RNA sequence: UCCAAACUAAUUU
RNA sequence: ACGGACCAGAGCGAAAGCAUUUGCCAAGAAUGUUUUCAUUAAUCAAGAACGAAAGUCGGAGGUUCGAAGACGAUCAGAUACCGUCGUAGUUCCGACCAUAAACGAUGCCGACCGGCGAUGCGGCGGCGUUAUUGACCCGCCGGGCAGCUUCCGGGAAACCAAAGUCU
RNA sequence: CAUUGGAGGGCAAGUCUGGUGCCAGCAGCCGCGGUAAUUCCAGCUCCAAUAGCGUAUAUUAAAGUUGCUGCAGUUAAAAAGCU
């Protein structure tokens, strides 16, 4: 069955990206996905996304700009210290110039450049570039 | 390697079809694999129809037919030249030969 | 085994396109023409080229030949090409349409257009071939 | 694209498909760049101006370049809004 | 095209489209041609929306006027119902006609005799003229196509939803297209009708020719 | 004595196109060798990668022809690769330079980090794929050099890629699919969309369009 | 495929330790049967006594007599 | 739908 | 003993497998649902039920066919192919046995990703035909067995809408 | 008084000369030798690393050929008969 909601969300965004579609349904909306998409949206890879409330786990319609190469998840959510973070950088990211590893730290769901500034580790959710 | 997409037979949603016997040599063939040939050959051989009809005690007597459903194994149907071998792209063709 | 090769069939077609005005239905006449307008190296070839021109002259006389442009035939199928009748085929002034054809014209905003007499649609729905 | 001094260190900036926002590559020989003529608002004659759209070949092999140019021309209002 | 009342349909032209039968489509429907269709009838025939096919046909005309050298537009019909309309199209607009069999390598084989490099292709039928559409995807060459309900729109870049099956409806759509090229260039004017009488472009059958030679 | 036979070949010879960048912007199909000789001539260096013999069995013995792998490209971001089979060695080496010239692609160079000076390595992790072979190109730091097998090293040096880490996979003992998978990798350094290229593309008009007047009195 | 979960280290470590035995270089360096079978006994060299000069014929296509000692 | 088996150790392209 | 033709790239079953009529017994999928419970789930070492054919052990029965066996041919030979007989077996009832090219040579649960025409079951809607709620017709929805088509992508390729979403 | 290994290919370096004639021998691997040996035995040359250099054996990288990162399992080795 469905064990991981974030994985089915990012696989469906990734499949619609290479099909060249403009919009995509994301079924069940959790709050972890919403906090994941905003980090993708502040760095500007996706457009505005509409969240639909249906008195259960809702749906999200996402506008795609056409900028995304690959949004992936990492399973399990390995705990990552700041010592080991740069070894995840050259295994997930295509370059040191762009791309982000998304962490969930105690100060919230962060990309990896923000976690160095805040000096905290966390569990890894996924990545996008 | 695999030669045909079905495996030379028409078994899709079931496990085991009952077998029949080849009418030429009595080999056990599954029912969907066998080359079926329904023949409605006349019993008269139309070289002879103008002799049977002139010798009849009737005037309008339609001569009967002969309804035989033949079965064949793959060995006998090739040897009897019921079927032939086809090219690789021409195997993917299920329309029967015209009349 | 009288099949004529490509060097006879290609040479005979270029003769007729260049010299259609001289050729006729006599072999022996066109035999003398074909040596006059051409450098043919041998006499036995000359009879074959002239023998295939005269064969083609009957086919040209009845109709057109695939690959041969006859200026009598090419310029006078142009009347077939440049033809306009006195009335168009489109100006009919009463055009049999369907109620669905008419109802689209309302969404096209031409319901105030002239007649276009509607016909009753068929009630069968029998439009597919039996499988 | 550029080093931190500000010098544009590139050979060229490639075009992006105006329907899928992906790079039209160097040997993407199915990728078109068409022009839609502009008419003046009075007589409907060609004024000399035009809109340029580029459709990459993968969108074109998809068979969706028809609706793509049709949507890119409804944003300029070249195609009527009441389509 | 553009909500300009000078570029609208002018109902004179509607009686042409209904007399030829351009609104009629096939009994089956391509999924990418779905947006141009109004509604299916009772006999399975789909009805093409004439507002949709007017906008694309004017969109197609803007693509030809954007070509500077008029012979850079090449026009192809392999099917005979349309070979007459293509020749008379390029006679007016100055295009480059290819009637009949399209030999392959015409756009790719740069050493042979008939090797012309256009900038625009306009064809009659995507299924019948699939070979130059396929070769136009090698040489960065956008194509406009007359299309029916069942046409595969693969390398088609501007589709004109019409009836490209009837003889009266192929030639009319070539006639309406040629008229809107010369009006947007300003060669002919749009305050008065054009002197061509659109059945000049219609394909006439060979038995239809000889049967009226004694009538005319 | 070179007379061009293409519309693009006429505008090149008449000093109207100034670099290959005006061609590569519009993806124009190069079909003539001299167009590459016109711009990049006396800067290209060639190299034969391998002469492998191929054989066709016939009813009278074997019909051996010779297949030629030719690398080409100046050391500042252009690489071609040409394969041609002929009955003779010199006949194959000549003709495979032409096919290598008709496949000159641009190589986007990038920075490893701290973008100081000229771009020296691949911009990001790219991966070619040909046959069973996939060749990955990882951006190296500055004085690293090209840490690779000797066959793609001859391709990566002729692009002016100074720095790369290379991962390979599959049967690299065949040189043909291992040269092409390298060539497939560096030919998609421009195909990849970085954040540097999100700025909208201004459309310059096409060279078949901005010379319709010079072209029609000369090429026609 | 493979189990990926966060507590599957024992399943992964034991499956690995069992599947190490299925290749030749691990199997002969850890059974001790092959260590029991070579006459050096895990050494590089050995001193012996020549009993006999023996002629060994070469495998085809080679056709010589390889001079060996027993 | 009659029978129908075998093939230098003596090597060099 | 066996259930032809009807009988299909049709159905059902966890698989093996399953076809004369009628009755009885218990089961079950799919659909329908603005019912109920409220995470009860997914996959699974150990363990467990089922498992063609042949074979084994008891009873019953033995028509056909038929290992072994006996002959007639063919053959250089022919303890084989072909023919004529014919044991065990094939049939049923009660136990065993636990393997098959037990194959889609493709674990299961879940998500996303092109079209199109059909088919089977259930539901819903719709001109009209036909019979005294069915039969046809046109679609829609969902599960199912499949097909065609595609430069989705993949693959060593053959090929696969999964063997795709994998440097 | 500079050796140790080589010179068909992998792999840097000879179609040199003389002997031997599937012999003696070489050769990690593919191979060479049955009378013109680019491979043996020698001379000449040449190469490599050099006061060091071959050889045997354990072992690490190569090995994404043990795969956590990172392998496969339709037909190449392989998904248990089914639950
Ligand atoms: Mg079975
Ligand atoms: Mg029955
Ligand atoms: Mg068990
Ligand atoms: Mg049994
Ligand atoms: Mg018994
Ligand atoms: Mg017998
Ligand atoms: Mg038994
Ligand atoms: Mg088994
Ligand atoms: Mg697989
Ligand atoms: Mg060596
Ligand atoms: Mg190791
Ligand atoms: Mg490694
Ligand atoms: Mg392996
Ligand atoms: Mg196997
Ligand atoms: Mg199985
Ligand atoms: Zn048989």
Numbering used by the authors:
A (entry chain SW): 2 to 130
B (entry chain Sa): 2 to 100
C (entry chain SR): 2 to 132
D (entry chain SV): 1 to 83
E (entry chain SA): 2 to 217
F (entry chain SC): 59 to 278
G (entry chain SX): 2 to 71
Q: Which of the paper's sentences describe this entry?
A:
Recently, we described the drug-like compound PF846 and its derivatives that target proteins by inhibiting the translation of specific mRNAs by the human ribosome. These small molecules bind in the ribosome exit tunnel in a eukaryotic-specific pocket formed by highly conserved 28S ribosomal RNA (rRNA) residues. Surprisingly, PF846 can also block translation termination of specific polypeptides. Taken together, our data support a model in which PF846 inhibits translation termination by first slowing down translation elongation before reaching the stop codon and subsequently blocking NC hydrolysis from the P-site tRNA, thereby trapping the NC on the ribosome.
In striking contrast to the NC in PF846-stalled translation elongation complexes, the NC in the stalled termination complex adopts an α-helical geometry spanning 21 amino acids (residues 705–725), followed by the NPN motif (residues 726–728) in an extended conformation. Nascent-chain residues L718, L721, and I722 contact 28S rRNA nucleotides U4525, A4419, A3887, and G3883, and residues L714, I717, and L718 engage in multiple interactions with PF846 through van der Waals forces. In the present structure, eRF1 docks in the mRNA decoding site, positioning a highly conserved NIKS motif (Asn–Ile–Lys–Ser) located in the N-terminal domain to recognize the stop codon. In the present structure, we were able to model 4R-hydroxylysine at residue 63 in the cryo-EM density, with the hydroxyl group hydrogen bonding to the backbone carbonyl of asparagine 61 in the NIKS motif and the side-chain ε-amine hydrogen bonding to the O4 carbonyl in U1. The positioning of eRF1 in both the mRNA decoding site in the small ribosomal subunit and the PTC in the large ribosomal subunit indicates that eRF1 is bound in an active conformation. However, rearrangements in the PTC and ribosome exit tunnel could explain the slow hydrolysis of peptidyl-tRNA and trapping of the nascent chain by PF846.
